[PDB]
Amino acid sequence: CSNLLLQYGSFCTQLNRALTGIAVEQDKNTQEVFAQVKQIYKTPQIKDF
Amino acid sequence: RAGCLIGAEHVNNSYECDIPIGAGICASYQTQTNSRSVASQSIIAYTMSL
Numbered sequence: 673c674s675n676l677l678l679q680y681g682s683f684c685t686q687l688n689r690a691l692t693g694i695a696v697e698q699d700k701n702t703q704e705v706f707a708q709v710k711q712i713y714k715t716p717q718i719k720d721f
Numbered sequence: 722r723a724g725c726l727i728g729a730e731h732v733n734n735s736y737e738c739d740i741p742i743g744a745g746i747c748a749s750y751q752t753q754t755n756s757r758s759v760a761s762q763s764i765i766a767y768t769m770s771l
């Protein structure tokens with residue numbers, strides 16, 4: 673069956689490229705929303721707000 | 722947390738991400754020649770720096 677899929681065509685490289693683009697875009701969305709400022713800030717122990 | 726990483730020397734220094742592995746861990750090809758006497762250019766895994 674692998675040989676039949678090999679001589680049938682090469683669509684799964686395209687499929688994996690699309691899915692890898694989707695995954696990289698998911699990580700880029702997460703960096704776009706949450707990362708923002710690179711510097712991490714500690715909780716302000718002085719709590720008189 | 723993602724799984725089992727074999728072939729990368731885990732370092733518990735915190736560098737910025739080079740190759741996103743997953744589960745907050747990144748890999749990078751770093752120069753160990755200047756680090757440990759006469760060592761070899763090698764792949765290191767670590768926890769990515771936020």
Ligand SMILES: *[C@@H]1O[C@H](CO)[C@@H](O)[C@H](O)[C@H]1NC(C)=O
Pocket residue numbers: 731732733
């Ligand atoms: C990582 O931490 C362990 C103990 O927590 C320490 O022995 C080791 O030197 C550190 N660095 C490594 C494994 O590169």
